[PDB]
Design a protein around this ligand. Structure first.
Ligand SMILES: C#CCCCC(=O)N[C@@H](Cc1ccccc1)C(=O)N[C@@H](CC(C)C)B(O)O
Ligand SMILES: C#CCCCC(=O)N[C@@H](Cc1ccccc1)C(=O)N[C@@H](CC(C)C)B(O)O
Ligand SMILES: [Cl-]
Ligand SMILES: [Cl-]
Lengths: 243, 125, 250, 244, 204, 241, 231, 226, 196
């Protein structure tokens, strides 16, 4: 034993225990989801209200990369910010050299390689976040989810955090009941519902809902936050479904 | 580069590497210094375990740092050469810039300063 | 990041042993048998092509390697370590000699450079020793034919004949009885094939044996004509057929 | 991080000893014995090759005695590969001095430089020390014929007669007994071989298990000649002294 | 201003029957001022002889450099360097200073100790090798030396004849150059004996 | 026992980190196979999409390294993509420096040397992957070269990698013992893919739908991967005889 | 236990112990309170002395004319972080002629603290900060933790016994938020809030430290007889 | 200098003159301008002599190491690419103007390289001070589908044009033929149309003609024994 | 040098002369100035031959590496890589490049990159020393959405005049057609184009 004391050490299994311990930090965090729709993607996250002293709508969690990519994550918040800062550098240098905004699959590998690099040495710690991200590019909509190991795949729907199992079940129903696809406005409503349903795992404290979206029709392929009437409409739809 | 902190504090407020260096000095051959009214004498011990030695060429214990200052030592012989060399270089450097040979106090303060630096620098004992 | 292993991973133990070097020699002992014999008019080096799978094309894996036109090498131990050493050995022959003196290094000095690289992996920071022993056969104008062994420590010794790896202890005894100072090259090849048959279990033919010689100059292998002083490489790798011909007169 | 795997090669023991230096000296005590004897008219260097084979090419072999320049030579005891690293550095230092001052390097200055390099590996860098001990045999016009030794600690001392490697305790006693100040080279040759013949772990001392060298003013008029003995010449001097 | 003609000097080399010869003048000056008449330009490393013309600081520097390199070569190889090999070492050493060169004009001369074949070679300041069968020239009076060598020289001359030919080539070339002269030295080289002769010449 | 944490020798002359990297190779539980035709080299691999929420089009362990070279990986995807990105970079650099397309065997050697370095240098860990490179080389013809975490590599007549490699290996061995040739004597690559799938079915004992497989084909001057519908056509032809 | 030797090591439950130990240093530190209305933002800090001959350690540091913080924990680490904020506030002014947003100031502190938690050799910061400021979107209050987490709040408190003040503010939320255009009443509420964290000792003239920033009020610190009015 | 390259039926041939100059003086009358990069890849060089030699040795050394690494015979495009990238990097300061030719597994190839790093492809090429004299001959007599014998003739004729008409060129003609599926034949001094006539007189002196001051034996031997 | 690129209905056509000069000596009379950086992205080179070759070689390397990661690059992307090299190294380079390529989505596109390193997207572009003599002709005769045969005639006639007046231009007229159909190389000899 001792194989779990140092990063980048293979155990006799062929496992990197430090990366597996980073996953525990992710599982401890709040719930965050992603939904791929007809012409775009929708991101949503659970924000725990620790106290009345928290200013509503101020502590924003979802982060934009470039102008067409949204990023949300669960686990250690600072680690996620560090990853997004790198993503913004990667996206900037791509656009600097190649002119076009970075494609989503291309952007996914940039984060993937960076996170993977933090499993190669004992002088660094793995990332304590699973990141759900995506957007709209020339080839259409893309949704991805990236783990501490550097592993990522494309997704129809994605979920991570303390309420991931509840969320995953809800996402699977949408995939089955809508083979032809889901609209962007529908996806916002559904996203609200799923977060409210996933809040049963964090039911002690009340929470604040935060949604964002990229859609070719609804937002012109740019990342925007859901605000005001459209946010309230989604909250009402969500509150109606739980009752 | 090798940056490892070898000289560090212990719970009781001791730097063991510095204290173990003193034990190396305790092992070294005896050296004595006595100052009279108009002179100073440096006495040194030569251990007689080593005969068949060539006393002409064997490194002498007392070393001239300049024409007016000498340095004897107790401890690791190889380590002493490094301090002696640095001191000899500083003595010539002082003459070059100040246009006056070092005071005995100044040369001591320099050698002592080198010894101290090696107690809180990374990668060195 | 940064390589923060700036310290030695090979150190003296209380008994005065360098553990990592000893363990590297143990890895060499597990390796497949290879040998070298020196004749009056040449040198022969040989080993078994231990194929990891019958689907694997063993011709693509070269255990006997040309370092210079008049110097060859064979090994026992870890193959990957050998491969990178051959790459470094070929390069150092150019950078530290041919680009300076305009001619290929003599056997002993190329061996010295390889030895140096292996010594540094034994003292430098954040690295383990090479897990191989080399046998380097070669010819040069002023020293004639020669055969050297190189160990993980970086130590090297010249041999009239020797063997390393799996069945080296038995093979060295076999060579002591057969070797004399009047051997022709063909006689040395014959003795090499006899010696190597003892350590091999399965098939023993041109396809499972790798054998090369340092002998006469080969103008047919030079690739060009028009310069009298260039007469061709003394290193030649024997073909599968050439080995089988000598296995009939065995 | 990486701290976990650091042996810490450059630290003191509670007794004030350098662990790695002490262990390196233990390594050297198993190496083939090398002897140096200084006479009034020259210096002898004798050394024993370690358990050889009949199939070792002796006439082209060199593991003990090395030439640093025309005036200075060394006998090695320890890891040969480590020694060659230092030998090439010493050869360079001698040429640097010759280029700078247009004079051959004094023996002590060369010795001090190599000894300072060894010292560095014991105080800083976190690397293992060189597992080598040298006997320096050399001549210059200041001190004449000189013998020195250096070890992994970087400490060096001068000698009239000295041994390094295996069985030094026994060898040093035998040298201390028969050595005299008015001794000559031919006598010192005989003493060196007789000492090895008694301290050797082998059954008998033969030509194929020895490396031999002399530094003589026995060169035509005021100059110094280095003689690295050939196998046949070692065989002859063994018959002459009456060992074989 | 021109580095190759501040100090002045010349070197010439020739081949004969089982022999080679190399010669140089002895002048060192600072432009018009003659400073030294004992500045030899021919050096030897074992049985290989090197003559160097050009800027005198670089002549001294290069001699010290090739002494350094040949001494290490000998220690490692356990044999003296040969003319053919030394020629390649000079070319290598000069070209590594391609864009900050030594302002010199080297000339190599010697007999291969194994084959017995006579060998001479010349270089430019940056490495290019001129391996001639007949003769090599270098220095401030190189044009003069080319004219003398090309007319006086004939192949397969005996050592004592070759001495006369090379000596007259040098002497008469030097006397037509303001920055060469003030004495001269000739080396006659055979496979196992080398004679060095100082020539009597006009001291202006 | 720190000789098991970093890549230094154990008393037996073994590198335990390298041996454990070999074990990570089978973490994905996927089997791959590679064979050579007359004009082509085919590589097939199992595809497993366990989650319904996954986009199955993005799940892949076959990579297009260059126009001529393809690579299938046996091991975790992060390390797989690490090796893929590097191989792509090395192949591109080779073409730029030396003026011709990097051969399959040369790329394999280069990646093998990089792997060797991780077995010798302490600060770098081995990658837990086995890389199988395939192409139709312009000199050597159809080519299969495979690299592992030890830094070992060799050419192959055919090969198999994964948890059930031995069953596939013996199946292929027995076929080449009958035919007495170093390849699949077939004109079209379509039939060589059919051979590859057929013999994997026989060896593993499992049937395959269009979404259960992943196929890569190397021909002269290009390497390409088949779509689900291209594989379906292949599966139909196998069933009809 | 075995996973607290350095910051580069997760525990089996996914915890970073060196970060948690750094968080502990804040709890040992003296209490400090932060609260705001729509017009003004106030810091109140209880300073701590070594003994009766000693001075009372300063708790509040000015970063710019419109921004500053109060500290709790390792004071030298607060000096390093406040120096960084001063530079960032200054870079924003010199390059963009723009006063640094309080929210963006928090993001910069978060990212600086984070790098120390993921790399070998270094260590986490051992201090907690309460940043107040008035920018283009009005009054703001932030809470910084050396784990990297930064949070915008109406009111809060950190340090020893900070839970008492934090509860009072949670009751008074609706009252003190409405205190607009009245600095003295907002400070009164802050002084009354920090009083809920006191035991044995009371607020004296050289014990109390108050700071305020607002609409037409530069960041100013009050000490000595300047706070006798509020005792 | 006059160097040429001519393609033919089953390969390629290059040729060169043998004159080296230092201003208006001839430094070497029998200079070797045909350099071997690899066994079946040779290049001819013009411009700065040390540069053409050095850059050819360096790329030839690296080509050899590359051939060993890849287990393949080297290609002309590899030597071409390595040369141009090296020369471009030095912005023309390495004054090498080369004609690179050879046969490899791809076929027979002929290229030119300029000091600034530009390359050109062709069936017939010429470089150097006598390139205009040579190209005049090539443009007058070259045709498609030349035989080996016809190409050697054309190439040597083009060099002769430079030898006779260009003052920077002279002496002898060197040739190298690289045919597909054959060893490359290097024909040193293929033509020798400039042998010096017998001199009218012998200038051998009488022994003792030169005045000597001192004599001495030089010790070339090592320090002696005994 | 006389180089041009022209978009038309089915795609884009590149055209160039074949003359390389060292002063007034024609070092190469059969030069290929139409060079390939990708399957259906080519460029026309003018200025230093060494500089434009070195640049094009680097661009081909970048796009080969782009393709391996992100699939086929756009013509705009290729122009951006040329620009980045020409702009950032403007002090040390003398290169006037025209980039032309065919997508299925964007169809034929032409980007010109003059000395400074600026980029200009155009319906057609002309460059090189000989382009100066045909600004008037090309402006008067160019039409959008021409046919293939019409575009070949336009380029052939334009370069014919450029060759006629410019001493640095001459030899054969090379052309490269880029459409969905593929890549076609054309050549036109002096006897054909001089009589136009
Ligand atoms: C021997 C010797 C030194 C010869 C000096 C030397 O490089 N000459 C050059 C001409 C030149 C070049 C640059 C500066 C001045 C003089 C020369 O001879 N070039 C001819 C071919 C070379 C490769 C042999 B030819 O190309 O003109
Ligand atoms: C030396 C040499 C041969 C290279 C000559 C060489 O680069 N010529 C240039 C003209 C030029 C340019 C800048 C510096 C000098 C000479 C040239 O011919 N450019 C034509 C196009 C290129 C791509 C072939 B064209 O613009 O006229
Ligand atoms: Cl490599
Ligand atoms: Cl061009």
């Amino acid at each position: 034993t001792g194989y779990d004391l140092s990063n980048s050490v293979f155990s006799p299994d062929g496992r990197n225990f430090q990366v597996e311990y980073a996953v525990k930090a992710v599982e401890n965090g709040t719930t965050s989801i992603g939904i791929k729709c007809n012409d775009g993607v929708v991101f949503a996250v659970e924000k725990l209200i620790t106290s009345k002293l928290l200013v509503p709508q101020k502590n924003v969690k979802i982060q934009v990369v470039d102008r067409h990519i949204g990023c949300v994550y669960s686990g250690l918040i600072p680690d996620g910010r560090h990853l997004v800062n790198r993503g913004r550098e990667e996206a900037a240098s791509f656009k600097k050299l190649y002119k076009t905004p970075i494609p989503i699959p291309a952007f996914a590998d940039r984060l993937g390689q960076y996170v993977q690099a933090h499993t190669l040495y004992n002088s660094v710690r793995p990332f304590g976040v699973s990141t759900i991200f995506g957007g709209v590019d020339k080839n259409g909509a893309h949704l991805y989810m990236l783990e501490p190991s550097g592993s990522y795949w494309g997704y129809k729907g994605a979920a991570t955090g303390k309420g991931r199992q509840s969320a995953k079940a809800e996402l699977e129903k949408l995939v089955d009941h809508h083979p032809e696809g889901l609209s962007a406005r529908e996806a916002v409503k559904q996203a609200a519902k799923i977060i409210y349903l996933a809040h049963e795992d964090n039911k002690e404290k009340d929470f604040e809902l935060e949604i964002s979206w990229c859609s070719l029709s609804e937002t012109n392929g740019l990342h925007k936050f859901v605000k005001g009437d459209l946010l309230q409409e989604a909250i009402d739809f969500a509150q109606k479904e739980i009752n | 580069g090798y940056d490892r902190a070898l000289s560090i504090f212990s719970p009781d407020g001791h730097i063991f590497q510095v204290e173990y260096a003193l034990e190396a000095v305790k092992r070294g051959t005896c050296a004595v210094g006595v100052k009279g009214k108009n002179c100073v004498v440096l006495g040194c011990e030569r251990r007689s375990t080593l005969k068949l030695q060539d006393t002409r060429i064997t490194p002498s214990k007392v070393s001239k740092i300049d024409s007016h200052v000498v340095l004897s030592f107790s401890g690791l012989n190889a380590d002493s050469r490094i301090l002696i060399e640095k001191a000899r270089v500083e003595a010539q450097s002082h003459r070059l810039t100040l246009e006056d040979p070092v005071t005995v106090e100044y040369l001591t303060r320099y050698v002592a300063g080198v010894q101290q630096r090696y107690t809180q620098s990374g990668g060195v004992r | 990041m940064t390589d923060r292993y700036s310290f030695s991973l090979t150190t003296f133990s209380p008994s005065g042993k360098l553990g990592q070097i000893d363990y590297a020699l143990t890895a060499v002992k597990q390796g497949v048998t290879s040998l070298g014999i020196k004749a009056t008019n040449g040198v022969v080096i040989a080993t078994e092509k231990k194929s990891s799978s019958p689907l694997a094309m063993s011709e693509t894996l070269s255990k006997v390697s040309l370092l210079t036109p008049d110097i060859g090498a064979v090994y026992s131990g870890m193959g990957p370590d050998y491969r990178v050493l051959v790459d470094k050995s070929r390069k150092v022959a150019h950078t530290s000699y041919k680009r300076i003196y305009g001619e290929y290094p003599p056997t002993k000095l190329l061996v010295s450079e390889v030895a140096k690289i292996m010594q540094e992996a034994t003292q430098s920071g954040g690295v383990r020793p090479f897990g191989v022993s080399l046998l380097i056969a070669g010819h040069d104008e002023f020293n004639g034919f020669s055969l050297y062994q190189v160990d993980p420590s970086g130590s090297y010794f010249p041999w009239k004949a020797t063997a390393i790896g799996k069945g080296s202890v038995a093979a060295k005894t076999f060579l002591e009885k057969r070797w004399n100072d009047e051997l022709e090259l063909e006689d040395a090849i014959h003795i090499a094939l006899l010696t190597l048959k003892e350590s091999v279990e399965g098939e023993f033919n041109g396809d499972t044996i790798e054998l090369a010689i340092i002998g006469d100059e080969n103008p047919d292998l030079l690739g060009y004509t028009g310069i009298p002083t260039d007469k061709g490489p003394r290193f030649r790798k024997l073909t599968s057929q050439e080995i089988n011909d000598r296995l009939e007169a065995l | 991080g990486s701290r976990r795997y650091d042996s810490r090669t450059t630290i003191f023991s509670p007794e004030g000893r350098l662990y790695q230096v002490e262990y390196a000296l233990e390594s050297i005590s198993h190496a083939g014995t090398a002897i140096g004897i200084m006479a009034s008219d020259g210096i002898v260097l004798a050394a024993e090759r370690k358990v050889t084979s009949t199939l070792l090419e002796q006439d082209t072999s060199t593991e003990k005695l090395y030439k640093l320049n025309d005036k200075i030579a060394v006998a090695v005891a320890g890891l040969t590969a480590d020694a060659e690293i230092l030998i090439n550095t010493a050869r360079i230092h001698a040429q640097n001095y010759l280029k700078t001052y247009n004079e051959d390097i004094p023996v002590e200055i060369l010795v001090r430089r190599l000894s300072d390099i060894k010292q560095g590996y014991t105080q800083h860098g976190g690397l293992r020390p060189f597992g080598v001990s040298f006997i320096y045999a050399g001549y210059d016009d200041r001190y004449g014929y000189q013998l020195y030794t250096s070890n992994p600690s970087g400490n060096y001392t001068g000698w009239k007669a000295i041994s390094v490697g295996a069985n030094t305790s026994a060898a040093q006693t035998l040298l201390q007994m028969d050595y005299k100040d008015d001794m000559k080279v031919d006598d010192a040759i005989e003493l060196a071989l007789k000492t090895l013949s008694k301290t050797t772990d082998s059954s008998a001392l033969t030509y194929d298990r020895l490396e031999f060298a002399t530094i003589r003013k026995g060169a035509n008029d005021g100059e110094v000649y280095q003689k690295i003995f050939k196998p046949q010449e070692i065989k002859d001097i063994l018959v002459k002294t009456g060992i074989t | 201003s021109d580095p190759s003609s501040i100090n002045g000097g010349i070197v010439v080399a020739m081949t004969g029957k089982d022999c080679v010869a190399i010669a140089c003048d002895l002048r060192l000056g600072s432009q018009s001022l003659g400073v030294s008449n004992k500045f030899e330009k021919i050096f030897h490393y074992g049985h290989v002889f090197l003559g160097i013309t050009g800027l005198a600081t670089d002549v001294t520097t290069l001699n010290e450099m090739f002494r350094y390199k040949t001494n290490l070569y000998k220690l490692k190889e356990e044999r003296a360097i040969e003319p053919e090999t030394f020629t390649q070492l000079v070319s290598s050493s000069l070209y590594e200073r391609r864009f900050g060169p030594y302002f010199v004009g080297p000339v190599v001369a010697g007999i291969n100790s194994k084959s017995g074949k006579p060998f001479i070679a010349g270089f430019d300041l940056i490495g290019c090798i001129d391996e001639a069968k007949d003769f090599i020239v270098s220095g401030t009076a190189s044009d003069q030396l080319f004219g003398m060598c090309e007319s006086l020289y004939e192949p397969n001359l005996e050592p004592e004849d070759l001495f006369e030919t090379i000596s007259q080539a040098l002497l008469n070339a030097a006397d037509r150059d303001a920055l060469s002269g003030w004495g001269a030295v000739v080396y006659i080289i055979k496979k196992d004996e080398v004679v060095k002769r100082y020539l009597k010449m006009r001291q202006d | 026992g720190y000789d098991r944490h970093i890549t230094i020798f154990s008393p037996e002359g073994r590198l335990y980190q390298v041996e454990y990297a070999f074990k990570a190779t089978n973490q994905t539980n996927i089997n791959s196979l590679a064979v050579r035709g007359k004009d082509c080299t085919v590589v097939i691999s199992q595809k497993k999409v366990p989650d319904k929420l996954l986009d199955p089009t993005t799940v892949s362990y076959i990579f297009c390294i260059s126009r001529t070279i393809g690579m299938v990986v046996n091991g975790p995807i992060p390390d797989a993509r690490n090796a893929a990105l590097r191989a792509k970079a090395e192949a591109a650099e080779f073409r730029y420096k030396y003026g011709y397309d990097m051969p399959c065997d040369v790329l394999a050697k280069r990646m093998a040397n990089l792997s060797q370095i991780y077995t010798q240098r302490a600060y770098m860990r081995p990658l837990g992957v086995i890389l199988t490179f395939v192409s139709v080389d312009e000199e050597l013809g159809p080519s299969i070269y495979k690299t592992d975490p030890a830094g070992y590599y060799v050419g192959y007549k055919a090969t198999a990698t994964g948890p059930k490699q031995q069953e596939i290996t013996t199946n292929l061995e027995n076929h080449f013992k009958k035919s007495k040739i170093d390849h699949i004597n077939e004109e079209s690559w379509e039939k060589v893919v059919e051979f590859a799938i057929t013999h994997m079915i026989d060896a593993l004992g499992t049937e395959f739908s269009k979404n259960d497989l992943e196929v890569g084909v190397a021909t002269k001057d290009k390497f390409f991967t088949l779509s689900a519908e291209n594989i379906e056509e292949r599966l139909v032809a196998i069933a009809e005889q | 236990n075995n996973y607290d030797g350095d910051t580069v090591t997760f525990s089996p439950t996914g915890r970073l112990f060196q970060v948690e130990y750094a968080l502990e240093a804040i709890k040992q530190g003296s209490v400090t309170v932060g609260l705001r209305s729509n017009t003004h933002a106030v810091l109140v800090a209880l300073k701590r002395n070594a003994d009766e001959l000693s001075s009372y350690q300063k708790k509040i540091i000015k970063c710019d004319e419109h921004m500053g913080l109060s500290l709790a924990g390792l004071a030298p680490d607060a000096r390093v972080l406040s120096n960084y904020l001063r530079q960032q506030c200054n870079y924003s002014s010199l390059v963009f002629n723009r006063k640094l947003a309080v929210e963006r100031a928090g993001h910069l502190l978060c990212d600086k603290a984070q790098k120390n938690t993921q790399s070998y050799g270094g260590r986490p910061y051992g201090v907690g900060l309460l940043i107040i400021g008035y920018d283009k979107s009005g009054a703001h209050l932030l809470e910084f933790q050396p784990s990297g987490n930064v949070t915008e709040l109406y009111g809060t408190a950190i340090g020893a016994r900070s839970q008492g003040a934090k509860t009072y503010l949670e009751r008074t939320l609706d009252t003190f938020i409405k205190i607009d255009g009245n600095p003295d009443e907002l400070i009164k509420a802050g002084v009354e809030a920090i009083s809920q964290s006191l035991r044995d000792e009371s607020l004296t003239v050289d014990n109390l430290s108050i700071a305020i920033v607002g609409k037409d009020t530069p960041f100013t610190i009050y000490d000595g007889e300047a706070v006798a009015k509020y005792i | 200098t006059t160097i040429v390259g001519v393609k033919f039926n089953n390969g390629v041939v290059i040729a060169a003159d043998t004159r080296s100059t230092q201003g208006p003086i001839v430094a070497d009358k029998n200079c070797a301008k045909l350099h071997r990069i690899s066994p079946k890849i040779w290049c001819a060089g013009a411009g700065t002599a040390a540069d053409t030699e050095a850059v050819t040795q360096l790329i030839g050394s690296n080509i050899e190491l590359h051939s060993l690494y890849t287990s393949r015979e080297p290609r002309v495009v590899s030597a071409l690419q390595m040369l141009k990238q090296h020369l471009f990097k030095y912005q023309g300061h390495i004054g090498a103007y080369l004609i690179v030719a050879g046969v490899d597994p791809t076929g027979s190839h002929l290229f030119s390289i300029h000091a600034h790093g530009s390359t050109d492809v062709g069936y017939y090429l010429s470089l150097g001070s006598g390139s205009l004299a040579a190209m005049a001959v090539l443009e007058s007599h070259w045709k498609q589908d030349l035989t080996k014998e016809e190409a050697i003739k054309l190439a040597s004729d083009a060099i002769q044009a430079g030898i006779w008409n260009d003052l920077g060129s002279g002496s002898n003609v060197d040739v190298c033929v690289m045919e597909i599926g054959k060893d490359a034949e290097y024909l040193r001094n293929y033509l020798t149309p400039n042998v010096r006539e017998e001199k009218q007189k012998s200038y051998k002196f009488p022994r003792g003609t030169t005045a000597v001051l001192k004599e001495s034996i030089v010790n070339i031997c090592d320090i002696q024994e005994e | 040098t006389s180089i041009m690129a022209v978009t038309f209905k089915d795609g884009v056509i590149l055209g160039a002369d074949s003359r390389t000069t060292t002063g007034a000596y024609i070092a190469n009379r059969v030069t290929d100035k139409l060079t390939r950086v990708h399957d259906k992205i080519w460029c026309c080179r003018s200025g230093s031959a060494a500089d434009t070759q070195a640049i094009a070689d680097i661009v081909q390397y970048h796009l080969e590496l782009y393709t391996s990661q992100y699939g086929t690059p756009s013509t705009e992307t290729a122009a951006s890589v040329f620009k980045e090299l020409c702009y950032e190294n403007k002090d040390n380079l003398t290169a006037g490049i025209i980039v032309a390529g065919y997508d299925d989505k964007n169809k034929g596109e032409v980007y010109t990159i003059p000395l400074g390193g600026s980029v200009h997207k155009l319906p057609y572009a002309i460059a090189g020393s000989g382009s100066t003599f045909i600004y008037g002709y090309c402006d008067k005769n160019f039409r959008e959405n021409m046919s293939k045969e019409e575009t070949v005639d336009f380029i052939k006639h334009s370069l014919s005049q450029a060759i006629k007046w410019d001493g640095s231009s001459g030899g054969v007229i090379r052309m490269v057609v880029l459409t969905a159909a593929g890549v076609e190389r054309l050549i036109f000899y002096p006897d054909e184009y001089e009589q136009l």
